[PDB]
Amino acid sequence: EMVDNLRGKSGQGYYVEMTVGSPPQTLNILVDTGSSNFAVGAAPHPFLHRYYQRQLSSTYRDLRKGVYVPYTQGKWEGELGTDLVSIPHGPQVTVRANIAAITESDKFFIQGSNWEGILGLAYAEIARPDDSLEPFFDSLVKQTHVPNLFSLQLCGASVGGSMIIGGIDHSLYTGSLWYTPIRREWYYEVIIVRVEINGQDLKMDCKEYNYDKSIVDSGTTNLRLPKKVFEAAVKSIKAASSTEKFPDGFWLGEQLVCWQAGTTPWNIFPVISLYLMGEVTQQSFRITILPQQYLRPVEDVATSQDDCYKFAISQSSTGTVMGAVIMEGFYVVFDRARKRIGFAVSACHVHDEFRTAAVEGPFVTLDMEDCGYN
Ligand SMILES: CCN1CCN2CCS(=O)(=O)N(C)c3cc(C(=O)N[C@@H](Cc4ccccc4)[C@H](O)CNCc4cccc(OC)c4)cc1c32
């Protein structure tokens, strides 16, 4: 039914099948917890196989309002309207939703990605043009009896996974679910209270980890870190991996590292532990990230005598982003109803014979400081 209803290509987002208009036009839509607009290509573009044709939908209504959305990467502009929307491999309901018909774009659509639009699953507070444009999931919950919750199991060229709408599929994770509070309903903002690289605390004032916010974002590929944290992390990872020396360009994400097929030296790269604020005062839990996650494979037939990777941790000036490579191998529950995000080990979790991704707790901290930046 809903299990395995996501596809994708590495570094290019995960998408779900949707239909818009009447009769239904089928489109693949990138699932994005880091924005709040539902938008679809609605005019020819070199990288689009198909696009939303408003003239062929009897139920389309123009809202006579333009909209512009700049992301960290890429931007588009379009015309707002509403139409009927469904998810073939989700709940069997049909909802009228706001849709931005994209008429121009810059570095947004990706050659070969196989998606034609984006589903912003965050809150109205960051919807453009403003917060009166009701996001899709809000519309879904208002117009049907779907529980106000969804979960994402992203798995690691072709990738897959599941978006479970309205509930939690227990066959998709093992162990316990640990919940961290949604600090504010705009992005899915959370609080990181501690960061360790191979068990070694980075030793920063914990507000540094959340300057100016930390978010959980399926629509961004990398773990993005504030400059101060990024530099400390790179130094610690370099030192752990010092048995091999890589060009500075690798660490900046401007260059691949490759090894002969099957011989990637996983064991010289450290695990990264991110401790998230718990549901009880001064308690936390950690999720552990292996190099199989933060060294992202770049598929290319020309380089295929080797396995090559990009360093999927990069610097941010807009706060921490726990992107797709962080979510991969975890089952992540976006529990809007109880303003919390849950993490558990995924059915498709990453591991070799020495180490595995984990979600564990509780941990206690004596420093009663608030790690939230504002
Ligand atoms: C999947 C496409 N992709 C591939 C590569 N990289 C590059 C490395 S990276 O992950 O560090 N990074 C900068 C990158 C950043 C983004 C990126 O901005 N993704 C957006 C969705 C999106 C999906 C497909 C194409 C273009 C954009 C999120 O929505 C942003 N969420 C935070 C945010 C920021 C600013 C405004 C805003 O408004 C709502 C929201 C995407 C990539 C990369």
UniProtKB/Swiss-Prot annotation:
Paired cysteines (S-S): 155-348, 206-371, 258-308
Expression (tissue specificity): Expressed at high levels in the brain and pancreas. In the brain, expression is highest in the substantia nigra, locus coruleus and medulla oblongata.
One annotated Gene Ontology cellular component of this protein: endosome membrane
Subcellular location: Cell membrane; Golgi apparatus, trans-Golgi network; Endoplasmic reticulum; Endosome
Extracellular side: 1-374
Known glycosylation sites: 92, 111, 282
Keyword rRNA-binding assigned: no
Modification(s) after translation: N-Glycosylated. Addition of a bisecting N-acetylglucosamine by MGAT3 blocks lysosomal targeting, further degradation and is required for maintaining stability under stress conditions.
Keywords per UniProt: Acetylation, Aspartyl protease, Cell membrane, Cell projection, Cytoplasmic vesicle, Disulfide bond, Endoplasmic reticulum, Endosome, Glycoprotein, Golgi apparatus, Hydrolase, Isopeptide bond, Lipoprotein, Lysosome, Membrane, Palmitate, Phosphoprotein, Protease, Signal, Transmembrane, Transmembrane helix, Ubl conjugation, Zymogen
Regulation: Inhibited by RTN3 and RTN4.
E.C. number(s) listed in UniProt: 3.4.23.46
Inducing stimuli: Up-regulated by the Ca(2+)-regulated transcription factor NFATC4.
UniProt free text on domains: DXXLL motif is required for a proper endocytosis and retrograde transport to the trans-Golgi network, as well as for regulation of lysosomal degradation.
Purpose of the protein: Responsible for the proteolytic processing of the amyloid precursor protein (APP). Cleaves at the N-terminus of the A-beta peptide sequence, between residues 671 and 672 of APP, leads to the generation and extracellular release of beta-cleaved soluble APP, and a corresponding cell-associated C-terminal fragment which is later released by gamma-secretase. Cleaves CHL1.
Subunit structure: Monomer. Interacts with RTN1; RTN2; RTN3 and RTN4; the interaction leads to inhibition of amyloid precursor protein processing. Interacts with SNX6. Interacts with PCSK9. Interacts with NAT8 and NAT8B. Interacts with BIN1. Interacts (via extracellular domain) with ADAM10 (via extracellular domain). Interacts with SORL1; this interaction may affect binding with APP and hence reduce APP cleavage. Interacts with NRDC AND NRG1.
Family to which this protein belongs: Belongs to the peptidase A1 family.
Name of the protein described by the UniProt record: Beta-secretase 1
Covered range of the whole protein: 62 to 446 of 501
